[PDB]
Amino acid sequence: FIAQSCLAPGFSTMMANLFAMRSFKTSPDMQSWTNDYLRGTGMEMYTETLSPTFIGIPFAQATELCFSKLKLLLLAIEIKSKISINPRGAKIQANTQGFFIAQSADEVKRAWFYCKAMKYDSTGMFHWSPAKSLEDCILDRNQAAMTVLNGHVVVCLFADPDSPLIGLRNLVMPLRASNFHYHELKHVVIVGSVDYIRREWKMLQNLPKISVLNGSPLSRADLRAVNVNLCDMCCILSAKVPSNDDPTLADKEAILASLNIKAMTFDVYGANVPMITELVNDGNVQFLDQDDDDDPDTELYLTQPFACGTAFAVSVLDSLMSTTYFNQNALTLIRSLITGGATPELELILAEGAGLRGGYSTVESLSNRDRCRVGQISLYDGPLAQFGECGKYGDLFVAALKSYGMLCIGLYRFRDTSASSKRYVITNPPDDFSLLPTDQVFVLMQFDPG
């Protein structure tokens, strides 16, 4: 989820809220941005067999009809054995299982009753490298300052040499998927102790564009060396064991790092730097933000930092146990959407113990590069800017689907419409929802060769 947030900020919040079963009551009058956010939190994954009326039509026309008529968002279908996310030019076959996003399972049933009356690895899903050594990836303060790092990803790691391993692959490899061209790949720099990263370097040898800087991300000198003001996303991860002395002192390391970056000034200030923070305790989210009211008894997803895609914790993942049991395909859609398409026997390759092994690209293998990816767009400029002024969300959804095939999932707009550059996540707004010129849309982008 953290890796997906690098490509599109706030995506982790949309992911977490889409598997927690929440019942939403519309409210008469309260805070405006909270009301829009709470309506999105009532959305979750659902599966239903497609009506026979949909047989013989392409997916693009099928999901457009569901949104306009049934007010349902169809984003994935199963073709038989495998799940395709927003397929391009794929017919809707008989007895097809479809994935829908709706408030409740009752609304989903309308879809059933509708009627007229060496470059890549062996699997070819991720980029590959000829096992670059760790010593060649180590950079100094002057080495990192002289090189250009624009649009990169900074991984602030807090880990003792004896700390338990957290698997630094799981954040880098989704950023190294075959969906992205080699020129658009985001550079990854890790700030932390080399002793800990040395144990993690076994599975990072074959991942291109990886940099390691020794030191502590708390120090301002290291942060200025890697140009944190120009990075697309700064990730704060802690691997140290909890001392269990006090629940409020468990995340003292990440809170200090987050506050330190927010106060630094560059010759652009640090308060505008997009950051995501890992929390081992839910109650420490109150210290991540300053201009908000804090309550110990409030739920995590109700907090402002979580609603803005800034805070994240493993406590929101407990809902996956119930979701997996009711439908195995639900978990498969989760992994394919966040891990960059991790094929089954690829884990069998990984379980062997030899690490990531590459393969020669063929015409059959290169076909796997064509799949949808998670992306974010802006309505300020481009050929989709006409809907930013006063166009409805439904109009944007149809226009984007017909022109480029992008499937709009949600919106990412400022908390205050006027001061502060804080954006909250709205999941699947109604077709009559009003847009703003400063809005960002979560979309599923097709793979464009070339």
Partner 1 sequence: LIGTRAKYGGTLKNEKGRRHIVVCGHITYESVSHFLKDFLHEDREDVDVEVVFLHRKPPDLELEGLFKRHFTTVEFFQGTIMNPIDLQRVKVHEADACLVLANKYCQDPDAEDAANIMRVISIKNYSDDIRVIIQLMQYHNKAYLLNIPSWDWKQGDDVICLAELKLG
With binding defined as CB under 5 A, does residue 16 bind Mg ion? Answer: no
Piece of 53-61, 84-92, 227-235, 251-259 that binds partner 1 (CB under 8 A): 251-259
- The widest CA-to-CA distance across the chain, in whole angstroms, is 72
With binding defined as CB under 5 A, does residue 294 bind Ca ion? Answer: yes
Residue 222 binds which entry of Mg ion, Ca ion, a copy of itself, none, CB below 5-8 Å type-dependent: a copy of itself
Q: Which of 4, 12, 17, 206 binds Mg ion (CB under 5 A)?
A: 17
- Work out the angle at residue 202's Cα, subtended by the Cα atoms of residues 196 and 203, and round it to the nearest 5 degrees: 110
Site size toward partner 1 (CB under 8 A) is: 37
Phi, psi angle pair for 255, to nearest 5°: -65, -45
DSSP SS3 for 156: strand
> How far is residue 415's CA from residue 419's CA, in Å, rounded to a whole number?
10
- Residue appearing with tokens 């003792």: 160
- Edge-to-edge strand order for the sheet containing 210-213? 138-139, 210-213, 188-191, 153-158, 233-238, 275-279, 311-313
Site string for Mg ion, 43-72 (x = CB under 5 A): x-----------------------------
As measured in angstroms, the least distance from the Cβ of 86 to a copy of itself is 47
With binding defined as CB under 5 A, does residue 40 bind Ca ion? Answer: no
As measured in angstroms, the least distance from the Cβ of 67 to Mg ion is 17
With binding defined as CB under 8 A, does residue 248 bind partner 1? Answer: yes
Q: Which is nearer to a copy of itself, 172 or 228 (CB)?
A: 228
Q: Which is nearer to a copy of itself, 103 or 216 (CB)?
A: 216
Residue 18 binds which entry of a copy of itself, Mg ion, Ca ion, none, CB below 5-8 Å type-dependent: Mg ion
Residue 230 binds which entry of a copy of itself, Ca ion, partner 1, none, CB below 5-8 Å type-dependent: none
Strands 423-427, 407-414: pairing is antiparallel
Q: Which is nearer to partner 1, 78 or 289 (CB)?
A: 289
Footprint on this chain of a copy of itself (rule: CB under 8 A): 219-222, 351-354
Residue 42 binds which entry of partner 1, a copy of itself, Ca ion, none, CB below 5-8 Å type-dependent: Ca ion
Q: Which is nearer to a copy of itself, 57 or 221 (CB)?
A: 221
DSSP structure string for 356-422 = --EE---HHHHGGG---EEEEEESSSSTTTHHHHS-BHHHHHHHHHHHT--EEEEEEEES-------
As measured in angstroms, the least distance from the Cβ of 301 to partner 1 is 19
With binding defined as CB under 8 A, does residue 185 bind partner 1? Answer: no
DSSP structure string for 284-336 = GGGGT-SSS---TTS-GGGSHHHHTT-EEEGGGGTTHHHHHHH-HHHHHHHHH
Q: Which of 18, 62, 213, 225 binds Mg ion (CB under 5 A)?
A: 18
With binding defined as CB under 8 A, does residue 160 bind partner 1? Answer: no
> How far is residue 251's CA from residue 410's CA, in Å, rounded to a whole number?
31
Q: Which is nearer to Ca ion, 290 or 362 (CB)?
A: 290
Residue 295 binds which entry of Mg ion, partner 1, Ca ion, none, CB below 5-8 Å type-dependent: partner 1
Calculate Rg over the CA atoms of the chain: 22
Residue 389 binds which entry of a copy of itself, Ca ion, partner 1, none, CB below 5-8 Å type-dependent: none
Strands 97-102, 73-79: pairing is antiparallel
Q: What is the dihedral of CA 441, 442, 444, 449, to 10 degrees?
A: 60
Q: Which is nearer to a copy of itself, 133 or 265 (CB)?
A: 265
Piece of 9-17, 146-154, 225-233, 345-353 that binds Mg ion (CB under 5 A): 9-17
Q: How far apart are the first and last CA of the chain?
A: 28
- Residue appearing with tokens 């409210």: 27
- Residue appearing with tokens 């891990």: 339
Residues belonging to the chain: 450
> How far is residue 69's CA from residue 275's CA, in Å, rounded to a whole number?
39
Q: Which is nearer to partner 1, 177 or 337 (CB)?
A: 337
With binding defined as CB under 5 A, does residue 42 bind Ca ion? Answer: yes
Q: Give contact residues for Mg ion (rule: CB under 5 A).
A: 17-18, 41, 43
Q: Give contact residues for partner 1 (rule: CB under 8 A).
A: 218, 220, 245-246, 248-249, 252, 255-256, 259-260, 262-264, 271, 286-287, 290, 294-296, 322, 324-326, 328, 331, 334-335, 338-339, 344, 347-348, 350-351, 353
